[PDB]
Design a protein around this nucleic acid. Structure first.
Ligand SMILES: [Mg+2]
Ligand SMILES: [Mg+2]
Ligand SMILES: [Mg+2]
Ligand SMILES: [Mg+2]
Ligand SMILES: [Mg+2]
Ligand SMILES: [Mg+2]
Ligand SMILES: [Zn+2]
Ligand SMILES: [Zn+2]
Lengths: 488, 488, 488, 488
RNA sequence: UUUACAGUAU
RNA sequence: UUUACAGUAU
RNA sequence: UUUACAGUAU
RNA sequence: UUUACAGUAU
C-alpha cells in the first residue's frame, strides 16, 4: 500500500561493526537505498597525472594500473575535431579526476574537466560550458548574483544566496589548494581523496523530506555532527538522533531482510510471483514469474515487478545494459502502463537511466549509469567450481570428451605415454565403463601407455592431459603422478 | 575463406562408442551441425491420452508428469471461439503427439493434430487445413494427382509422382495402424515411438548435396543400409561408405575441436576476437569482443561473430529468446550488413528463426524455435557450488550476514541457544575477527548460548542457523552438533 | 640432584577449568603424582546385587554390563573348598563393592568383603580375618583398646586413640546405614558412591610431610575446608592456602611439561637419553636409549631410566605386566644396582608392585596393580587409521593383495561381477600398474565384469570386495557403486 | 591333524606378477614358509671397503649410509685383546660382507670374515677357525679328503666326495675372482651381489624331502632349470614341474589365506582362540586368548598357540626379542609341555633361536636371529595418523592441553598475538566449550590477541601454536593464517 | 651354517 | 514442414 | 590397606 | 549534477 509521503523517511546509519559501515534510506520500513563501506571508494579522487601512451590516451595517476583518458575530456587550458596526437604530448602532466572506477580489466575513466561537489553547488572550475539547474527543482536569479571566471544542486531549494556564496567560496578555496599542490611536486601523485560514506550521504542524499537521521553509535554520531556543520547543513543538526535500543537499528526498522534480497537471484514480489536477476558478460537480465483473470494477473505482477526492479537496480548498484522480460500481455495499453510504472518507479534514482518500449519479443531494454561498482563485483567472486557458467558438464559427457582427447594425444608420433589426471569419478568411468576403449587405444596405437590417474584434489570440470615423449618417461607410480606433475 | 559449394558435404556418423552415437554434417572440415544420441528423444512420439484436468487442458500419456494440451490443438473429429470446458470432457480419450519435450517444470506440448514424416511428405491426417510446399523449393502439379480425404518435403525436388504416392501410402498404412491400436485398448498408452538418431538424419538431413555418408562401424553401417532402403532413398545407397582409418573419423575430418566449442562459454573467432554465450532464466545472451582502422575491425568482427553465432545456435541446440550484443558500430549501413549476415548465416538452420534490427542500445534480439533440448539442459547440470549464479559471496560479507542472523535469533523470547553451523572459514571469521561481536550478543541477550560450529562438510554459500528453545537443549558437544542436526 | 626432603611437598589442586579437575603432588617443582577428574570414578562404589548366572559368578548391580564375582570373595554370612554352585543361588541378593573398574570387555571385580576407608582406619565389617598394621609405619596398643565384632592407615602415625575411635565409629554408622538401605528395597541398586577426587586426595594422600595444599579457586577451596574438617584432619586446615597468581598454578610450579610427558611415547631423561613406553595387548613395554666410558653411560642412563619409569608408572596409571628393556650392562653388580634403584624408586607408589631380576635376555619383568584405569584407556582412543597396529600396509602390497582377492572371487561359479571398492591410490594402482592383470582375469574367467571403483571416503588399509551373482546385477554406474553398496 | 611326513612338501614358486615374486614351502596345504621378492636383498653382498672413522669402526662400501664393522670381525691378514685404534688405520681398504641389512638407523653389520655359500659347502676363505658339520646331519671322512689352506651344508647328506670337491672348487674360483677385482680398482665398490630369491631357495631350502617344485610361469621355469644345473642339483631337475591351472597356484594349494595371516595382528588358532602379535620399540609381544575343563582348554590352546607362533615367526620374518604371554596354567608340567612344544615347533626354522622357561609372571622370553628384514619393516610404514602409538588422544584432553599451551605463550613478555592452528573439532571446542577460557586469557594477559583457527588440513593429534611478538604482527585474516604459516 | 653362532652395540 | 508456423503459456 | 594382597580369570 | 549527460571504448 506504499504511497510516498505517508510515513517518515529516515536515514539509518549503522556503525556498530568495524568491518562494514552501513547507511540505509528507509521510508517507513521500506528500504529504498543502501550504502555499505568497508575499511574503499576511489571515484572522484583527484590526481596529478602523467600521460603514458597516446594510441584519447592512457595515464599513470599512481595506481597499479594506468587510467583511461578521452579526447573528449582533455582541456582548453591543457591543450598546448583534431587528433589527440596533437593536443597532448607523451609524459605531459595534467590535473585528473576519476569518472568511473576500475571495472574488470578497464583502467578508469579520468577527466581533465574536474568537478567539485558541495552541499548546494558543484564547481566546474575547468569549464564554463556546463552549469545551471538541477533538472529536479527564484534561483535562476540567486544564481546570477555570483562571481566566477558551475551548477546548483537539488538541495539549494530551501536556502538563500549567501549560502550559495558560502558554498561557492569554499569550493574555490579547494580549487586553489588543488592546483597549488599540483604546481608543487612531481606528476604521479594523489591530490584529493573523496569523502567517506557518511559524508557523501549527508552531502548527496539529504533532501528536506528526510525526517530523522538515526545512529547506532555515539563516537560516530559525534563525528556525524561535526560533519553536518562543516557541511553547511546546520538545519539537520536537530535531526541527528542517537539510537539506543537493544534490538539492532536496521533490525528495529525491519529492513535486514530487504537488505539481504539485494543478494538473492530470486526476489519475491508482494502478490506472490517473483523476479530473477541474472548477470552476464554483456548485460543483466531480469525475468519475471507469476505466482499461483489471467490478463489481470500478468498485468498486476508485471507492475509489482517494475517497482521491485527499480529498487533492486539501486540496492545492487546495477549499471550498464539491463534487459527485462516482463510477463507477456496482449493489450498494448498494458505494455505502456508497465513501461510507465517502471519510469515512474525509477524517478528517485540518482543515476541516469534510459528506458524503452517492450519489443515485439516482449523484451524491455534499459540502461543505468555506473555510479559505483555493483554488489556482485564488490562482494562476490566468480564461483570457482563452474567458472561463471553456472553449470557443470555431466560426467560421461566429460569423460568421453577426455577419452577422445586421450586417443588423439596417443596418435602423435614420438609419444611414449599419456597421462590423464582427472577427477575421481571420471577416472572411475574411464577405467570401468570405458576400460575396453582405453584398452583398444593401447593395443592399437601400440606401445603407448595410457595412464589415467584419479585425483581427489580436482572436481569435475577440471582435468589435465599430458603427453610424455619417447625418452622423457620415468618409473613413477600412477598415483604419484599428480604431484610429479604439480608444476602444471 | 568458406564458400558454400567449394568442398564436399559429408554426413559423418561416428558409432564406435556404445554410450554416445554421433552424427556430424560437415562441409569440408567445417562442422555445421551435430547430433548426439545416448542409450533419449521423446519428441514426435504418439500416445493414447486421457484428459486429467481442464482448467486447453493437461494430460496423462503415461509419463511421470502429465502433458499440456492447447485448445488451439484440439480437433474437429475430437470435438464431441469457445471455451475448452466445452469441447473436451474430463477423462476423455484422444490421440496425442508431442510437439515440445519436457523442459524444466513444463509437461510437454501435445497436439491432437498429428503429423507423420516420411522422406518426401508429411501426412497431416488429423487436418486438411495445413499442407503444401516447402518454402525452400512441376510439383504443384505432381502434388494434386494424389488421393486423400499434407505437405511435400524439401527433399522431393529430385523425384517423381509414384515416389510421393509410394510415400503417401506408407504414411496412410501407419495412420491406419495408428488409430487401430488406439481403438484397441485402454487410454494411457504409447502408440508410436520416433525413429532413432540415424534414421532421423537420413529422413531429415539428406539434401541432394550430401556427397558421401561415412561410417566408422560395420554393424551400424549395415543397419544403415537397411535404413536407407526402407526409407525410400535407394539413390544414397551408393553414397554410404564405411570408414576404416586408425585415426578416428571425426578426428580425421578435424572436427572434434569444433564439436567441443559447443561446450565452451567463450568461442574464438577467425580473425581473433570472440563471442561469449551466457544462458539465463529468461534468455541466452551472446556478447562479442574484438581481438587486438577501428570502424573496420568492429565491422569485420561482428560479421565473423554473426556466422559463428549462427552455427553455435545449432550445435548447442539453442531455443527461445536470444539477445546478441554486437560490437557497436556508428555507420547505420554496418548495422544492416550485420543483421543481414546473421539472416544469411541462419538460412540453412532447420528451426524457425526470427531476427530483428539492432536497438538503439546496440542490442539485437532474436528467437529460435525449440527443436530439441539444448546442450546445457541435456549434458550439463546446475553447478552445485553457486546454484546457477556463477558467483560466490565473499567471506566477510557472508559472515557479517550470519552474525546478524545470529543476533536476531538470539533476541526471540524463549530462546536457550542458537547454533550456527557453517563453512570452516566462516567459523574462523565469526570466532576471531568477530569474537567480541558474538560475545556482546551473549552478554547482552543474556543467558543465551551462541554456538558457532565449523563444518568441513560445507562450502561457502551454504550454512544453517537453528534456534534451540528453553527446554529443548541438550548436553551435546559443539562439533557433535552438525551430525545431531543432520536431519535438517 | 633430587634428594627427598630438601624441598617442600605441596599438593596443588587446580580447579579453574570446569571440565578437568586436577590434583598434583609436587616435591619442589618435581611432579610425582597426578590425578585428574572430569564431570568419573566407579571403584569402591557399593551396590545391592542380584546374581545373574553361576557358571564365582556374574552380577547385576545395575550397570549396562553385569559384574564379576569370585568364589574367593563370597561371604560366611552370605553362604546360606566347595563349588559356588553350592553357596550362592541364582537371583540371590548380596552386598557388593567394586574392586576393579570396567576394563575393555571385563565386567568388574566385585567383592562381598566390603572395605570402608576413613582417614585413619579401614573397617572390614564383612570380615575379621584381615586387619592390622600399615606395612609402612605404640599403636599395636592403641589398636587393641577398640570395640568391634579392621586396619590402621599409614596416617594414624601422628594421632591418639580417641581419633581412631572417632574414625572407627563414623565408619560403623556408615556400615549400619549401609546394610539398612540394603534391607530396605529391591536388589539391583547403588548403595554408596565413592568420594570425589579432592576428597580421595585428602583422605588418601595427606602424609604429615605435605607442606601446603594450594588451591586456584575460592569456591572449591571453601568446599575444600569443609572436606578436611568433615574428614577429621583439623591439623591440615592451616595448611590449605588459596593461590592467587595471574600465572596459572601448575604453571607457576613449573609442572605442566611433566604432566604432558605422561602422554608422550618418548620421555627424555636428565642426562640426555630416553625411555619409550609402548603398550600392547598383553603388556606395556618400556625400552631405553642412551643419548650421545661406555660401561658407565649404560649404567647411569639405566639408573635415570629407572627413576623415570617409576613415576611414569604412576602418572600414566599403568597396571598389569610391564617389561623393561634396560640398556645392556656386562657387570652383574650393575644389574643389581639397577633393579634396586627401580625398587627404591617405586617405594612411595601406593599400588602393589612386584619386580624381578634382569633376565639373560636383558629384560626386566614387573607387575603393578590396577588402582584405576590408565591414561590411554581413559583419554585416548584407538587410532582409527591403523586399528591399533601403528602401521599401515604399503600400497602395492595391499593392492596385489586385493588383486588376488578379486581373481578368487571371479572364479566362484555363478558370479556375474565383482566390485572392489577401494582407497583412491589402490584404484589407481590396480587400474594402471595392474591393468593387464585385471584384464587377464576378465578375459580368462570369461564374461565376469571386474569393477574396481576408487573412493575418497576410504583410506589405505580399508576396502571392500563384493561379489555379484548372475541375476542380481544392476545397470549402476561405476562411481555410483560405493553409495549403492553403503549398506555394507 | 598335522603329522610331518604324511603329505608331500612342495616348493610353490609363483611368478605371474612382475611386481612380487613369491616362493612358498608348503607341506600338503600347510604353508610353512614364504619368501617374496620385489624388483631387494642386500645381505651377503660383498664390497671393497674404505674405513671412515674409528671411534670396531664404520665403513663406506658405497651406500648412502656407512656400515658398521666390529673389532671381533677384523682379520689376521687385514691386521697390519687390543684396541681397534691399533689394527686398522683410517681410510684403510678391506674386503667386506654384509651380515645384517640396514635396520632403522643402523648402518649394517659388515665382516672381514667372508663366507661363500654353495649347495653343499660354505667356504670361509678368510678364516680356518670355523668349519665342520651341520648340527643337523661317513662325511667327517669325506670332508678330510679335501684340499685347502670351511663347512658342509645340511644338504650334503645324500652325495659323495667329488661333488663336495666340485663345489669346493667353484667356491675357490669365486674367492680368487673375488680378491682379484679387489686388487684391481679404487676401494669404494660392490664386488659380489647375492643371488635372487629363486636361486637362494634352490640353494638353501632344497632338502631331499621336497617332493615337487611347481612353477606358474614358463619363462621363469626355464630360467629355473638352468639355475638348478648351474647349482649342482641335477637330481631335482626331474622335480621341477610347470603348473598350468586356470586357478592360480598358491590359490589351488589353498595357501593364500595363510599368507595373508602373516599380515594380521590377530591370528585364529585351530580350536578357536587366537594369538595377537604386537610389535614395539624393544620387542615383539605375542598374547594369547582362549575361544569359548578349564585347565585343559588353557593347555590345549597354549599348545596350538605355540605351533602358530612358530610359523608366524617365520612368515613375518620376526627377529630379536620376543615375549610370549601364554594363557596361565597351574600345573608346572603344563608349563614345560608348552615351552617344549615351542622348541619342537621351531626346530625346522633356519634362524638361530633361543627359548626359555615361563617366568613367574607367566611370560616366556625368546630370541630369534635376524635373517632378513620383517614384513612390518618391509611392507608396512608407520601409521601416519597416530605415529606408531596406535592411539589418538581424546578431543577435550587435547584441547585443554592446547588451551594451557595458549595461555602460557600469552604470558611471555613482548607477545602481541598467539595463533593456535588446529584440527577443526579442537577449534570448535576451544571456541565454544572453552570460549570464556580463551576470553579470560585475553582480558587478563591484556592486549594479547588469541587467534585459534580451525584447519581441515589437520587431524587430531597434530597442531601448531605460534607466538607473534610485538612488532612482527600482520593484518592477515584468521583463516588465511594456516597458509601464511605454511613454512612451519 | 660346524663350541659355536644367535640376541645386543651404529 | 506449405499464411503460415516460430517465440510464449503448465 | 595389616601373611598378606598384587599380576591373572569375565 | 544544469542540452545535456547516461549506455559504450582500455
Ligand atoms: Mg518469462
Ligand atoms: Mg549466468
Ligand atoms: Mg560488449
Ligand atoms: Mg634397547
Ligand atoms: Mg603398538
Ligand atoms: Mg593374556
Ligand atoms: Zn558455480
Ligand atoms: Zn594409527
Amino acid at each position: 500500500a506504499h504511497i510516498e509521503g505517508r510515513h517518515m523517511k529516515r536515514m539509518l546509519i549503522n556503525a556498530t561493526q568495524q568491518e562494514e559501515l552501513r547507511v540505509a534510506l528507509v521510508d517507513g520500513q521500506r528500504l529504498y537505498d543502501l550504502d555499505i563501506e568497508s575499511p574503499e571508494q576511489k571515484k572522484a579522487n583527484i590526481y596529478k597525472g602523467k600521460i603514458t601512451r597516446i594510441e584519447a590516451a592512457f595515464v599513470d595517476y599512481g595506481a597499479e594500473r594506468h587510467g583511461f583518458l578521452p579526447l573528449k575530456e582533455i582541456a582548453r587550458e591543457y591543450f598546448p575535431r583534431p587528433n589527440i596526437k596533437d593536443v597532448l604530448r607523451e609524459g605531459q602532466e595534467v590535473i585528473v579526476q576519476i569518472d568511473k572506477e576500475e571495472r574488470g580489466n578497464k583502467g578508469a575513466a579520468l577527466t581533465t574537466f574536474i568537478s567539485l561537489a558541495g552541499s548546494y553547488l558543484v564547481l566546474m572550475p575547468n569549464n564554463p560550458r556546463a552549469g545551471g539547474i538541477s533538472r529536479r527543482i527564484e534561483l535562476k536569479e540567486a544564481l546570477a548574483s555570483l562571481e566566477l571566471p558551475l551548477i546548483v544542486r537539488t538541495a539549494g531549494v530551501g536556502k538563500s544566496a549567501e549560502a550559495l556564496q558560502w558554498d561557492l567560496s569554499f569550493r574555490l578555496k579547494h580549487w586553489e589548494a588543488i592546483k597549488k599542490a599540483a604546481e608543487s611536486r612531481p606528476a604521479p601523485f594523489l591530490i584529493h581523496q573523496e569523502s567517506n560514506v557518511i559524508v557523501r550521504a549527508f552531502r548527496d542524499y539529504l533532501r528536506q523530506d528526510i525526517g530523522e537521521i538515526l545512529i547506532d553509535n555515539p563516537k560516530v554520531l559525534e563525528l556525524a555532527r561535526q560533519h553536518i556543520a562543516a557541511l553547511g547543513r546546520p538545519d539537520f543538526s536537530s535531526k541527528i538522533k542517537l539510537y539506543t535500543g537493544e534490538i539492532p537499528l536496521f533490525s528495529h526498522y525491519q529492513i535486514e531482510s530487504q537488505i539481504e534480497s539485494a543478494f538473492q537471484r530470486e526476489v519475491r514480489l508482494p502478490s506472490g510471483g517473483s523476479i530473477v536477476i541474472d548477470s552476464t558478460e554483456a548485460l543483466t537480465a531480469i525475468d519475471i514469474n507469476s505466482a499461483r483473470d489471467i490478463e489481470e494477473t500478468a498485468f498486476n505482477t508485471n507492475l509489482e515487478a517494475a517497482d521491485e526492479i527499480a529498487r533492486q537496480l539501486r540496492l545492487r548498484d546495477l549499471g550498464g545494459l539491463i534487459v527485462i522480460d516482463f510477463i507477456d500481455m496482449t493489450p498494448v495499453r498494458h505494455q505502456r502502463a508497465v513501461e510507465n510504472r517502471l519510469r515512474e518507479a525509477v524517478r528517485q534514482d540518482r543515476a541516469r537511466i534510459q528506458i524503452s518500449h517492450i519489443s515485439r519479443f516482449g523484451l524491455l531494454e534499459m540502461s543505468r549509469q555506473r555510479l559505483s561498482p555493483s554488489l556482485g563485483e564488490s562482494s562476490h567472486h566468480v564461483c570457482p567450481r563452474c567458472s561463471g557458467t553456472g553449470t557443470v558438464r555431466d560426467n560421461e559427457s566429460l569423460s568421453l570428451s577426455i577419452l577422445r582427447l586421450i586417443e588423439e594425444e596417443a596418435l602423435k608420433e614420438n609419444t611414449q605415454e599419456v597421462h590423464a589426471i582427472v577427477p575421481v569419478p571420471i577416472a572411475s568411468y574411464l577405467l570401468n565403463e570405458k576400460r575396453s576403449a582405453v584398452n583398444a587405444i593401447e593395443t592399437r596405437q601400440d606401445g603407448v601407455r595410457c595412464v589415467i590417474v584419479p585425483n581427489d584434489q580436482m572436481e569435475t570440470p577440471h582435468y589435465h592431459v599430458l603427453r610424455v615423449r619417447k625418452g622423457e618417461e620415468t618409473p613413477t607410480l600412477s598415483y604419484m603422478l599428480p604431484k610429479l606433475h604439480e608444476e602444471a
